């Protein structure tokens, strides 16, 4: 059975050892086509290290997939990979970190797939942790970051739906793109009296947002926060100026490994390639480089999309959506405690939510 | 020794290259340069997307460049994968001549100026050409993209800010037979029609049109610079009215304008405390420049009067405010110009409109 190239690129330290030998199940592969994985370590993430290194990768070796996995808070990752995915055709799935915060708006030609909930379902989470302890009354904050309409309309569209007494008091928009020398974003923040506060922004976005909110009172008790992943980010670095009491939905390495995780991404990847082979008596041929894409243009196609997003491995539904997120992802609510310390207070799994506490703590 | 501060521009030729050098070297005659002194790094567009990334990074921001003027090159590269790059460090990008509605979009484009506007803002002068000749009922009709619908709501905006849309009609981008559309535009009092569309698209409208007896006598058609450009003009109802950018296309002017603005705002940067340069190069660097949203501020607030183009601000979306544009119309086959709209109001020349019929 003929060999397709995959790479795993492991941004910043992590268990190689670990990696390779929960792959074993490489005698789990049954297919038309077998995997033959090759693990990249990538030092830096700025736009020109991944691209160079991705593209290097593509060039020396017959790549039909990417794995990407990484160790930081850097949601702009996700952006830089969908960019490379949709200019050279290649399918890359963003499993940890940065890689896997989430990109709104993908490209149309993007091959880009994503481990971790949509925008529109932490939005949903975040009105049903809500809904259980009767916290019916509040605000909304984002700032430009892509997403932040598709987050604002599902609250706006869930809350019209109901025979709930919701009340949305508030919609801020924070202009970050500019400097606060003006004392803009406090003045902004000074408007918001609800005890429930929904903040939809990156994780250097809040630092500075809370440190404003701070200021002029809003962090304490009778102000909730609730952020969604990308916010909380790596769980073990949790800047000073988060508020105690921050709640958070979070996808970020619980109980689903990165040695299982890139298991999966060689998995949806080898899966997609025979299921095409299998269908097509063809597979799409690797870029021979990505510097000669204007060219090659009308020889490629983002035909294997279709099956990249329908793979079931091992007894799970390993599906994305259209948007290019995971279909089930497992959740974990987690709240900021007195000690700084994230702590777990709540799951979801399979439209239902189990919280811990019937009485919501106090920190 | 003053400090060097780098411009960066990625434009269309080697020609462009050597305009945007002298601009600059003008600048540092023009302003007093024992504090700071600018120095021009530029280069020509890569023929795809992520060999301009890259070249942005290698060529552009090695040199720490506080800013990027970039062109519309010639004869499908777009200036985003330079906004995408400078974006990501928060250097500001000023584009020279696009014209689409998408680079005003913030989530998509943190950092981007333009010393002109977007399509959609040609609704400004539609809408002062509905008050001048009295037209209070309009039928609107847009393609389903991006561009149709920024030209919607910019005009909706300014008529529920009078005269009225009686309906708006929007098509599928690439249909052919668009009767259906027209026919739905044809069974409503109001006579007069706005259109949005590409090039292709406007072919479309125009023929189906003609079937259809709309651009007779009766009717008014009120239209953009894309309708009444290449293609679409071999199949335009005679009567047209559209529209040009003075100056739209002229990269030299609007280089010479966009580096007259940036050097103001430049020793106006360092007229604050705590700046700090950008990043040398893109490699092992994540982090934004910690000033360039200050300089945005700066560039945002720049006001230019004497400028080739004419009077140089930018509203809030970084868009150029106060352009010139031709109002043109379409006489036995010829553009003919019959006014311009200097940038706030109407001026008819002596050269008499001739409607469709007359
Ligand atoms: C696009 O075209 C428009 C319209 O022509 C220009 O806007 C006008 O600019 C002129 C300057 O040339 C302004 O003229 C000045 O008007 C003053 C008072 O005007 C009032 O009343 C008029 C009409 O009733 C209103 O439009 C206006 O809003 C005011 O309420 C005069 O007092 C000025 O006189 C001064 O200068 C003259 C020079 O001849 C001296 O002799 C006088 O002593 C005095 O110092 C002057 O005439 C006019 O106000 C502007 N109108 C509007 C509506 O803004 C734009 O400049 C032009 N844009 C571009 C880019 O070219
Ligand atoms: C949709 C296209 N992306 C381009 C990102 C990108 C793509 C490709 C590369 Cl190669 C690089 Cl290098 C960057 C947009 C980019 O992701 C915008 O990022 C932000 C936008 C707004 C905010 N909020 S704000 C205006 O308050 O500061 C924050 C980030
Ligand atoms: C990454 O840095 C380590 C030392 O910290 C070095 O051993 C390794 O070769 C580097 N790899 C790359 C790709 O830079
Ligand atoms: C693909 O999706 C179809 C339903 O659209 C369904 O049969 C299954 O989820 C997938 N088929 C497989 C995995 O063979
Ligand atoms: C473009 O503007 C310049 C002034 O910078 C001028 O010299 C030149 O004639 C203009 N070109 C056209 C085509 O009008
Ligand atoms: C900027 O201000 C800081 C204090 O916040 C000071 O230490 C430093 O000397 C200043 N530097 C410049 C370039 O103004
Ligand atoms: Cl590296
Ligand atoms: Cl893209
Ligand atoms: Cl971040
Ligand atoms: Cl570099
Ligand atoms: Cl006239
Ligand atoms: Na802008």
């Known amino acids: ?363 | 020794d003053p400090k060097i501060v780098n411009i960066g521009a990625v434009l269309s030729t080697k020609k462009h290259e050597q305009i945007f050098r002298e601009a600059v070297n003008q600048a540092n005659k023009r302003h007093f340069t024992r504090k700071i002194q600018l120095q021009a790094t530029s280069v020509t567009h890569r023929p795809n997307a992520i060999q301009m990334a890259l070249s942005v990074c290698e060529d552009l921001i090695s040199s720490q460049v506080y800013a990027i003027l970039v062109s519309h090159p010639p004869a499908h590269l777009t200036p985003t994968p330079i906004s995408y790059t400078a974006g990501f460090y928060r250097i500001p990008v000023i584009g020279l001549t696009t014209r689409m509605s998408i680079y005003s979009d913030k989530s998509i484009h943190l950092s981007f100026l333009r010393t002109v506007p977007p399509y959609s803002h040609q609704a400004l002068v539609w809408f002062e050409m509905m008050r001048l000749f009295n037209w209070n009922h309009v039928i609107l009709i847009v393609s389903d993209d991006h561009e149709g619908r920024a030209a919607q709501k910019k005009l909706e905006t300014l008529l529920e800010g009078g005269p009225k849309a009686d309906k708006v009609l929007q098509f599928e981008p690439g249909t052919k037979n668009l009767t259906a559309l027209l026919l739905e535009a044809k069974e409503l009092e109001a006579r007069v029609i706005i259109l949005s569309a590409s090039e292709d698209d406007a072919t479309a409208v125009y023929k189906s049109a003609a079937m259809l007896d709309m651009t007779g006598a009766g009717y008014v058609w009120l239209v953009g610079e894309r309708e009444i450009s290449g293609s679409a003009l071999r199949y335009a109802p005679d009567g047209i009215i559209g529209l040009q950018l003075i100056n739209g296309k002229n990269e030299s002017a609007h280089i010479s304008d966009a580096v007259a603005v940036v050097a103001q705002a430049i020793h106006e940067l360092f007229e604050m405390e705590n700046i700090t340069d950008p990043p040398r190069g893109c490699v092992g660097n994540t982090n934004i420049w910690k000033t360039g949203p200050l300089f945005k501020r700066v560039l945002m607030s720049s006001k230019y009067p004497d400028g080739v183009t004419g009077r140089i601000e930018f509203n809030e979306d970084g868009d150029r405010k106060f352009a010139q544009y031709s109002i043109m119309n379409l006489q036995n086959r010829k553009l003919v110009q019959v006014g311009i709209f200097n940038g706030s109001y109407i001026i008819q020349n002596d050269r008499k409109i001739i409607w469709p019929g007359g």
Request: with cysteine.
């Open chain 1, 1 to 363: 059975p003929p060999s397709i190239g995959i790479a795993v690129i492991l941004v910043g330290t992590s268990d190689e050892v670990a990696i390779k030998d929960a792959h074993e199940k490489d005698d789990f592969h049954h297919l038309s086509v077998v995997p033959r994985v090759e693990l990249v370590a990538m030092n830096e993430t700025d736009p020109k290290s991944i691209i160079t290194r991705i593209c290097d990768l593509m060039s020396d070796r017959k790549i039909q997939g990417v794995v990407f996995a990484d160790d930081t808070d850097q949601e702009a990752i996700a952006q830089i990979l969908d960019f490379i995915s949709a200019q050279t055709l290649t399918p890359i799935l963003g499993i940890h970190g940065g890689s896997s915060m989430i990109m709104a708006d993908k490209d149309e030609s993007s091959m880009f797939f994503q481990f971790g909930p949509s925008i529109e379902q932490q939005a949903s989470v975040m009105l049903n942790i809500m809904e259980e302890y009767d916290w019916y009354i509040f605000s909304i904050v984002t700032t430009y970051f892509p997403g932040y309409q598709d987050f604002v309309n599902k609250i706006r569209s869930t809350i019209e739906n109901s025979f709930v007494g919701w009340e949305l008091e508030e919609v801020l928009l924070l202009d970050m793109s500019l400097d606060d020398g003006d004392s803009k974003i406090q003045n902004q923040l000074k408007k918001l009296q609800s005890p429930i506060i929904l903040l939809y922004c990156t994780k250097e976005e809040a630092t500075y947002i809370f440190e404003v909110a701070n200021s002029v009172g809003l962090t304490g008790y009778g102000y909730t926060w609730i952020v969604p992943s990308l916010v909380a980010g790596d769980t073990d670095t949790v800047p000073s100026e988060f508020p105690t009491g921050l709640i958070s939905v979070s996808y970020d390495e619980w109980d689903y490994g990165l040695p299982a995780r890139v298991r999966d991404g060689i998995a949806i990847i080898t899966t997609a390639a025979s299921d095409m082979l299998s269908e097509h008596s063809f597979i799409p041929e690797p870029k021979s480089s990505c510097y000669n894409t204007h060219e090659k243009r009308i020889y490629q196609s983002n035909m294997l999309n279709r099956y990249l997003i329908n793979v079931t491995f091992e007894g799970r539904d390993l599906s994305f959506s259209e948007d290019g997120y995971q279909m089930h992802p497992k959740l974990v609510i987690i709240l900021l405690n007195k000690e700084r310390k994230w702590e777990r207070v709540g799951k979801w799994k399979d439209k239902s939510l189990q919280m811990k506490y019937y009485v919501w703590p106090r920190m």
